[PDB]
Scaffold this active site. Sequence first.
Site, mmCIF file in Angstrom:
data_model
loop_
_atom_site.group_PDB
_atom_site.id
_atom_site.type_symbol
_atom_site.label_atom_id
_atom_site.label_comp_id
_atom_site.label_asym_id
_atom_site.label_seq_id
_atom_site.Cartn_x
_atom_site.Cartn_y
_atom_site.Cartn_z
ATOM 1 N N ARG A 67 35.911 -1.732 -83.933
ATOM 2 C CA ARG A 67 35.803 -0.878 -82.795
ATOM 3 C C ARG A 67 34.701 0.185 -82.878
ATOM 4 N N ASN A 83 47.144 1.836 -93.551
ATOM 5 C CA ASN A 83 46.652 1.839 -94.893
ATOM 6 C C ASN A 83 45.136 1.709 -94.819
ATOM 7 N N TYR A 84 44.434 1.999 -95.921
ATOM 8 C CA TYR A 84 42.983 2.115 -95.883
ATOM 9 C C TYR A 84 42.315 0.842 -95.418
ATOM 10 N N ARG A 85 42.874 -0.277 -95.846
ATOM 11 C CA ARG A 85 42.345 -1.590 -95.475
ATOM 12 C C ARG A 85 42.494 -1.738 -93.985
ATOM 13 N N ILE A 145 46.205 -0.699 -79.651
ATOM 14 C CA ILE A 145 47.437 -1.319 -80.105
ATOM 15 C C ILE A 145 47.315 -2.815 -80.365
ATOM 16 N N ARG A 146 46.176 -3.418 -80.036
ATOM 17 C CA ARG A 146 45.894 -4.804 -80.397
ATOM 18 C C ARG A 146 45.767 -4.955 -81.895
ATOM 19 N N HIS A 147 45.561 -3.872 -82.632
ATOM 20 C CA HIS A 147 45.478 -3.950 -84.095
ATOM 21 C C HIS A 147 46.840 -3.937 -84.719
ATOM 22 N N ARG A 165 45.081 5.788 -71.583
ATOM 23 C CA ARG A 165 45.916 4.601 -71.632
ATOM 24 C C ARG A 165 45.114 3.321 -71.879
HETATM 25 C C1 LIG Z 1 32.942 -10.073 -78.953
HETATM 26 C C2 LIG Z 1 34.462 -10.054 -78.904
HETATM 27 C C3 LIG Z 1 35.078 -10.170 -77.678
HETATM 28 C C4 LIG Z 1 36.455 -10.127 -77.538
HETATM 29 N N1 LIG Z 1 36.998 -10.227 -76.257
HETATM 30 C C5 LIG Z 1 38.361 -10.215 -76.079
HETATM 31 C C6 LIG Z 1 38.943 -10.297 -74.803
HETATM 32 O O1 LIG Z 1 38.329 -10.361 -73.750
HETATM 33 N N2 LIG Z 1 40.293 -10.290 -74.684
HETATM 34 C C7 LIG Z 1 41.049 -10.232 -75.809
HETATM 35 O O2 LIG Z 1 42.251 -10.240 -75.687
HETATM 36 N N3 LIG Z 1 40.504 -10.098 -77.049
HETATM 37 C C8 LIG Z 1 39.156 -10.083 -77.208
HETATM 38 N N4 LIG Z 1 38.638 -10.012 -78.487
HETATM 39 C C9 LIG Z 1 39.598 -9.791 -79.650
HETATM 40 C C10 LIG Z 1 39.956 -8.234 -79.502
HETATM 41 O O3 LIG Z 1 38.835 -7.413 -79.221
HETATM 42 C C11 LIG Z 1 40.730 -7.388 -80.542
HETATM 43 O O4 LIG Z 1 40.087 -6.337 -81.313
HETATM 44 C C12 LIG Z 1 41.339 -8.229 -81.586
HETATM 45 O O5 LIG Z 1 42.001 -9.277 -80.939
HETATM 46 C C13 LIG Z 1 42.227 -7.251 -82.400
HETATM 47 O O6 LIG Z 1 41.639 -7.084 -83.667
HETATM 48 P P1 LIG Z 1 41.876 -8.323 -84.630
HETATM 49 O O7 LIG Z 1 41.940 -9.581 -83.834
HETATM 50 O O8 LIG Z 1 41.006 -8.366 -85.802
HETATM 51 O O9 LIG Z 1 43.406 -8.184 -84.970
HETATM 52 P P2 LIG Z 1 44.078 -7.150 -85.977
HETATM 53 O O10 LIG Z 1 45.546 -7.132 -85.608
HETATM 54 O O11 LIG Z 1 43.480 -5.758 -86.046
HETATM 55 O O12 LIG Z 1 43.836 -7.919 -87.329
HETATM 56 C C14 LIG Z 1 43.789 -7.274 -88.566
HETATM 57 C C15 LIG Z 1 43.616 -8.429 -89.515
HETATM 58 O O13 LIG Z 1 44.857 -9.085 -89.748
HETATM 59 C C16 LIG Z 1 44.726 -10.479 -89.611
HETATM 60 N N5 LIG Z 1 45.743 -10.939 -88.662
HETATM 61 C C17 LIG Z 1 46.574 -10.209 -87.866
HETATM 62 N N6 LIG Z 1 47.377 -11.054 -87.171
HETATM 63 C C18 LIG Z 1 47.071 -12.321 -87.528
HETATM 64 C C19 LIG Z 1 47.547 -13.569 -87.133
HETATM 65 N N7 LIG Z 1 48.492 -13.732 -86.206
HETATM 66 N N8 LIG Z 1 46.981 -14.684 -87.691
HETATM 67 C C20 LIG Z 1 45.975 -14.570 -88.619
HETATM 68 N N9 LIG Z 1 45.488 -13.340 -88.994
HETATM 69 C C21 LIG Z 1 46.045 -12.240 -88.463
HETATM 70 C C22 LIG Z 1 43.290 -10.799 -89.189
HETATM 71 O O14 LIG Z 1 42.581 -11.399 -90.249
HETATM 72 C C23 LIG Z 1 42.688 -9.458 -88.896
HETATM 73 O O15 LIG Z 1 41.459 -9.289 -89.505
HETATM 74 C C24 LIG Z 1 37.260 -10.005 -78.653
HETATM 75 C C25 LIG Z 1 36.647 -9.912 -79.906
HETATM 76 C C26 LIG Z 1 35.263 -9.939 -80.038
HETATM 77 C C27 LIG Z 1 34.674 -9.824 -81.417
HETATM 78 C C1 LIG Z 2 38.153 -10.599 -107.133
HETATM 79 C C2 LIG Z 2 39.609 -10.406 -106.808
HETATM 80 C C3 LIG Z 2 40.562 -10.155 -107.791
HETATM 81 C C4 LIG Z 2 41.903 -10.014 -107.413
HETATM 82 N N1 LIG Z 2 42.844 -9.798 -108.406
HETATM 83 C C5 LIG Z 2 44.168 -9.631 -108.073
HETATM 84 C C6 LIG Z 2 45.103 -9.402 -109.061
HETATM 85 O O1 LIG Z 2 44.755 -9.379 -110.225
HETATM 86 N N2 LIG Z 2 46.442 -9.213 -108.767
HETATM 87 C C7 LIG Z 2 46.854 -9.263 -107.458
HETATM 88 O O2 LIG Z 2 48.037 -9.079 -107.194
HETATM 89 N N3 LIG Z 2 45.910 -9.517 -106.453
HETATM 90 C C8 LIG Z 2 44.575 -9.688 -106.753
HETATM 91 N N4 LIG Z 2 43.661 -9.903 -105.735
HETATM 92 C C9 LIG Z 2 44.234 -10.038 -104.324
HETATM 93 C C10 LIG Z 2 44.864 -11.491 -104.303
HETATM 94 O O3 LIG Z 2 44.006 -12.421 -104.902
HETATM 95 C C11 LIG Z 2 45.372 -12.189 -103.009
HETATM 96 O O4 LIG Z 2 44.728 -13.353 -102.480
HETATM 97 C C12 LIG Z 2 45.316 -11.276 -101.862
HETATM 98 O O5 LIG Z 2 45.943 -10.100 -102.290
HETATM 99 C C13 LIG Z 2 46.013 -12.065 -100.726
HETATM 100 O O6 LIG Z 2 45.027 -12.425 -99.758
HETATM 101 P P1 LIG Z 2 44.566 -11.218 -98.793
HETATM 102 O O7 LIG Z 2 44.458 -9.943 -99.598
HETATM 103 O O8 LIG Z 2 43.383 -11.478 -97.898
HETATM 104 O O9 LIG Z 2 45.786 -10.957 -97.807
HETATM 105 P P2 LIG Z 2 46.378 -11.928 -96.668
HETATM 106 O O10 LIG Z 2 47.871 -11.699 -96.728
HETATM 107 O O11 LIG Z 2 45.845 -13.308 -96.814
HETATM 108 O O12 LIG Z 2 45.884 -11.341 -95.258
HETATM 109 C C14 LIG Z 2 45.032 -11.942 -94.332
HETATM 110 C C15 LIG Z 2 44.384 -10.829 -93.506
HETATM 111 O O13 LIG Z 2 45.387 -10.026 -92.904
HETATM 112 C C16 LIG Z 2 45.186 -8.666 -93.157
HETATM 113 N N5 LIG Z 2 46.390 -8.087 -93.768
HETATM 114 C C17 LIG Z 2 47.513 -8.695 -94.246
HETATM 115 N N6 LIG Z 2 48.385 -7.749 -94.655
HETATM 116 C C18 LIG Z 2 47.821 -6.533 -94.436
HETATM 117 C C19 LIG Z 2 48.239 -5.231 -94.674
HETATM 118 N N7 LIG Z 2 49.418 -4.954 -95.206
HETATM 119 N N8 LIG Z 2 47.394 -4.214 -94.338
HETATM 120 C C20 LIG Z 2 46.148 -4.452 -93.769
HETATM 121 N N9 LIG Z 2 45.736 -5.723 -93.524
HETATM 122 C C21 LIG Z 2 46.565 -6.741 -93.866
HETATM 123 C C22 LIG Z 2 43.978 -8.496 -94.048
HETATM 124 O O14 LIG Z 2 43.005 -7.760 -93.349
HETATM 125 C C23 LIG Z 2 43.496 -9.908 -94.342
HETATM 126 O O15 LIG Z 2 42.124 -10.080 -94.038
HETATM 127 C C24 LIG Z 2 42.316 -10.090 -106.069
HETATM 128 C C25 LIG Z 2 41.356 -10.315 -105.109
HETATM 129 C C26 LIG Z 2 40.020 -10.478 -105.479
HETATM 130 C C27 LIG Z 2 39.002 -10.737 -104.441
#
Ligand SMILES: Cc1cc2nc3c(=O)[nH]c(=O)nc-3n(C[C@H](O)[C@H](O)[C@H](O)COP(=O)(O)OP(=O)(O)OC[C@H]3O[C@@H](n4cnc5c(N)ncnc54)[C@H](O)[C@@H]3O)c2cc1C
Ligand SMILES: Cc1cc2nc3c(=O)[nH]c(=O)nc-3n(C[C@H](O)[C@H](O)[C@H](O)COP(=O)(O)OP(=O)(O)OC[C@H]3O[C@@H](n4cnc5c(N)ncnc54)[C@H](O)[C@@H]3O)c2cc1C
EC number: 2.1.1.148
Lengths: 243, 245, 245, 245
Positions: free
Chosen positions: B198, B187-189, B93-95, B86
């Site tokens: 993690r 998804n792969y990303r 589930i924080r992801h 758990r």
């Molecule tokens: C050293 C360290 C210590 C930490 N300690 C704690 C702690 O004590 N308590 C705690 O609660 N957390 C803590 N965190 C954060 C925590 O560990 C989680 O893994 C994290 O909050 C979940 O992963 P993520 O934030 O990248 O979110 P994810 O949901 O996995 O994010 C996936 C991606 O989507 C984007 N995304 C998703 N939601 C949003 C949003 N609302 N706005 C903008 N972008 C978004 C982000 O760019 C992110 O990269 C810590 C992190 C680090 C690095």
């Molecule tokens: C060199 C280059 C060329 C590109 N060419 C094209 C193109 O030709 N056509 C086109 O359509 N796009 C293209 N892209 C992608 C495009 O430019 C957009 O900016 C991008 O798709 C949106 O920003 P983002 O991908 O970070 O997603 P955002 O929506 O800005 O997400 C922010 C964060 O949240 C997370 N996130 C959001 N949604 C998801 C999800 N569904 N699954 C997992 N994580 C998520 C990601 O981890 C990310 O870091 C290109 C990108 C690059 C770098």
Amino acid sequence: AETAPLRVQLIAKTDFLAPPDVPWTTDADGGPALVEFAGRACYQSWSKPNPKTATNAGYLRHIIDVGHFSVLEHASVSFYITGISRSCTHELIRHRHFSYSQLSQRYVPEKDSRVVVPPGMEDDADLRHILTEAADAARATYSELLAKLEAKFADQPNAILRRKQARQAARAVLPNATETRIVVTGNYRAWRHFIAMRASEHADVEIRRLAIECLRQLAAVAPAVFADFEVTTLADGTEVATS
Amino acid sequence: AETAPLRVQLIAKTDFLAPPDVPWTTDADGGPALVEFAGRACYQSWSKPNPKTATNAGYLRHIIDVGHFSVLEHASVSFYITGISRSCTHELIRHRHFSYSQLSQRYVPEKDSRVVVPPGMEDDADLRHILTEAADAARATYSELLAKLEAKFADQPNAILRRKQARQAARAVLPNATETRIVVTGNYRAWRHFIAMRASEHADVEIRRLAIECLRQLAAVAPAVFADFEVTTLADGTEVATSPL
Amino acid sequence: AETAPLRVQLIAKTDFLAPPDVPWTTDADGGPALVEFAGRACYQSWSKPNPKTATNAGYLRHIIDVGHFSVLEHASVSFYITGISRSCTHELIRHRHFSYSQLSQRYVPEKDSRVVVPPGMEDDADLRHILTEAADAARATYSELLAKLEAKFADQPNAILRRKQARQAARAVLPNATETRIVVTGNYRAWRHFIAMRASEHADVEIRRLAIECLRQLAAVAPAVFADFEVTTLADGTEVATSPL
Amino acid sequence: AETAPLRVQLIAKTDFLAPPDVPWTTDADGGPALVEFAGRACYQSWSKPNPKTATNAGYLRHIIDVGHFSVLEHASVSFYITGISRSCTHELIRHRHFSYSQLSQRYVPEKDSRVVVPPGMEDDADLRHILTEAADAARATYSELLAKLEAKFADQPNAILRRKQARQAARAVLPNATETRIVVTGNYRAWRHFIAMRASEHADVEIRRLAIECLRQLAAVAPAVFADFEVTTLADGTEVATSPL
Ligand SMILES: Cc1cc2nc3c(=O)[nH]c(=O)nc-3n(C[C@H](O)[C@H](O)[C@H](O)COP(=O)(O)OP(=O)(O)OC[C@H]3O[C@@H](n4cnc5c(N)ncnc54)[C@H](O)[C@@H]3O)c2cc1C
Ligand SMILES: Cc1cc2nc3c(=O)[nH]c(=O)nc-3n(C[C@H](O)[C@H](O)[C@H](O)COP(=O)(O)OP(=O)(O)OC[C@H]3O[C@@H](n4cnc5c(N)ncnc54)[C@H](O)[C@@H]3O)c2cc1C
Ligand SMILES: Cc1cc2nc3c(=O)[nH]c(=O)nc-3n(C[C@H](O)[C@H](O)[C@H](O)COP(=O)(O)OP(=O)(O)OC[C@H]3O[C@@H](n4cnc5c(N)ncnc54)[C@H](O)[C@@H]3O)c2cc1C
Ligand SMILES: Cc1cc2nc3c(=O)[nH]c(=O)nc-3n(C[C@H](O)[C@H](O)[C@H](O)COP(=O)(O)OP(=O)(O)OC[C@H]3O[C@@H](n4cnc5c(N)ncnc54)[C@H](O)[C@@H]3O)c2cc1C
């Protein structure tokens, strides 16, 4: 074991700064002000043109009526919630359009950790006692494991990282009822869906209690946004909220 | 208490059906092929002029190298995970870009739940028995509370509700180490970010071992998408997986 | 001058692999099998006492009925949509729980770009003509601009960079109706909410027409997940889709 | 054609209200103060042992270096942006962790819409004139289509619908350069990400300009949060914003 009651404290909300070269004003401040500005920007309707909705309160009511909830997303509220159980936050964090920061049992010592009594047990001294006795026994195991794991890991020179290696294994024994603390940030739309979902009859009672308290305080801040939510009491004494 | 070993099972992945009116093919199928297709669709680049990106792994490594991670979102993989604590799922589930379906303690009777042993005590019969006896006590207490809450709520005429009402409260005394089971789709990303967060030396070792295991299974499905990750051992015998990207 | 018809190609779907040591089977595979498994995993209930829910369809029916939508997220479909306008995709991409890969006007020549005729003027050949000819004028202007830009930028020795720098300014003049092309991946829940918002009457007819087409292909592969939706014809003669859910 | 300049106005930030039963205080208010609180709540680290992070800025800088970005999510900023093309916002709404409210073309009068000059042609009278004359043409062709479209829908009695139905097909001929206006809200994490993606050398110059301007106003609100980004200048004389993280 000491027990912890639910406390929800509002710590953040939206500061609205209206843009000068736009010719508009409204009877509202902050988040509700911003939401109006955003729905109006959609039609550049800065003249209040449908006099029905020439109030913030009336405008906001109309947005909810038509189902244009995206405009609700611009305003946000943060809470600091204490006296919430671990199991409850395990349910809460399933809601993905929130941001969260939570007390971590990997870093924070929990030998004096409090428990949160399930609402079903609140009115029963026998049940509460069983719980707190069981929690005391768990904390004692947690301290017994912590000390033995620290010995085991003595050859890790970073004391800090040792402590953490010990602590994260030892918390294995802490119960679900262990109190956590969490900052929760959500926009109005995220909040509405959370209340819809967790304040229903179907939701576990602890998270229902939380949702209702959130609604109470969110309604104080954005009366029009949450006005359609109705706090009823049920046959069993507990409260639910519905639209 | 019975103990539960971690087990991660791949139960779903992408099946890709190339559109036959696009003058294009590649040396691969599934997720990996969809990803190349989506990328090429951005530039309508069907003919493959550059030999360096002429194969599917070559193209994918370029996608990774140039940061175009959006294209990785079209392909997914699902897993059924068992023997996970758990507390560990409570980190998982924080992801927020994964989808989850989880064994509910509100619906599933837990009288005989297994325990998951923290990796830091796995190899130590003493610590394990301290945890298992404390869990046995916690279940015994669980059961005591359940019968009592069922009595307390006997005036609820829906017996299904009633047990739910009882279980959700009895579970208060169940420990972090209690096993849960969960289906996780990303998804792969989403998976790459999960691994990066993690699988690092800063993560709890339980979630970290999950990360590395998902990684190795994902690497079998899509070697080019996950190849930049390197599993590497630590001073203390445990592993990390990190990428320069 | 050349007009683009809506075409929607299912290019990906979920491949399911039931885990061996779990005593459950079902009358389905792929996505809809995955979703049943996900839902059962919540209750650890693998048996079939109820003939209503003893089949995949009845089980999926019921999950939808009680509104456990989370379970629908585990399964995905990807389309390759050609023959959709720029303005239309500009509405599509506001749906944030989809993943996208779109033909970029920064990298792909639009010299001979097709246009998408709005459906509210598909028949009236007069209005068509005023569109096709306005677009030919915009295409001419884009080619004029591109040439001048390429020549202005001649000292950018990187030829792919020059082109990109030139096209991305030149495309300023291309109209809203210009064809784009796009891969769209959504899980069953994302699709259901899209279909429900963009197949209504209140939605623009071009995006409506995309939604219903997506709907009918989603039904061909996951009938029970999307069974509650019904295509009806409006006073207009244009189709809409609805479900009371 | 009128030509709109980019304009970005900060219309929303976070109001922070320290909870009085917590023994902590800091040299800051608003967003930056909320973030520290959220970070310290994780470790219940209210007294401030380390002097290096005993200031708000020292704490925030340390949050970034360690990569704990979750905590940046509590605070947000809203902007109202005008003088941005449709092509640009079409790139902007690819960002899914933002909230948008955009001026609609189905509802607002595009009869005398201003145009945004792509930065690539901003300094050349010959090219600007080509654009603005193609634009004028286009708005001429849009009236022809509008007035004639209302007529094909005289049979429909609902007026405000009828207008909408005519625009929605009439804007087909409007060009990518046509001005739009949008309210954009995101949290600090989301802003950082937009800036990293769209302030890069690889991004279109129009969105790049937008991103650098947003970076500027965000850095004033919360300097410690945005300090790792430096704006430098490429050999061609366009700006980029890059961070080492
Ligand atoms: C050293 C360290 C210590 C930490 N300690 C704690 C702690 O004590 N308590 C705690 O609660 N957390 C803590 N965190 C954060 C925590 O560990 C989680 O893994 C994290 O909050 C979940 O992963 P993520 O934030 O990248 O979110 P994810 O949901 O996995 O994010 C996936 C991606 O989507 C984007 N995304 C998703 N939601 C949003 C949003 N609302 N706005 C903008 N972008 C978004 C982000 O760019 C992110 O990269 C810590 C992190 C680090 C690095
Ligand atoms: C060199 C280059 C060329 C590109 N060419 C094209 C193109 O030709 N056509 C086109 O359509 N796009 C293209 N892209 C992608 C495009 O430019 C957009 O900016 C991008 O798709 C949106 O920003 P983002 O991908 O970070 O997603 P955002 O929506 O800005 O997400 C922010 C964060 O949240 C997370 N996130 C959001 N949604 C998801 C999800 N569904 N699954 C997992 N994580 C998520 C990601 O981890 C990310 O870091 C290109 C990108 C690059 C770098
Ligand atoms: C009767 C019932 C029984 C349930 N039983 C269980 C159970 O046994 N085990 C279990 O694990 N869960 C169960 N769930 C789901 C669980 O209760 C969670 O609360 C729920 O999955 C999270 O809230 P949400 O689904 O509205 O998603 P949220 O994260 O709160 O999302 C809010 C909104 O964002 C959208 N959204 C977010 N992410 C996505 C996504 N990736 N794809 C598409 N849209 C998205 C959705 O439209 C949603 O409306 C059950 C739900 C119900 C109604
Ligand atoms: C009558 C009407 C008029 C409209 N007018 C305009 C207009 O003039 N201008 C304009 O720009 N838009 C307008 N919109 C909004 C627009 O039409 C889009 O459809 C909408 O913004 C995007 O779709 P969605 O809201 O379903 O969100 P989606 O991206 O499709 O997400 C679907 C689900 O995920 C959840 N979700 C995603 N992100 C968040 C978030 N950050 N917070 C909380 N939940 C989230 C939603 O709650 C929902 O549950 C209007 C909408 C309606 C109904």
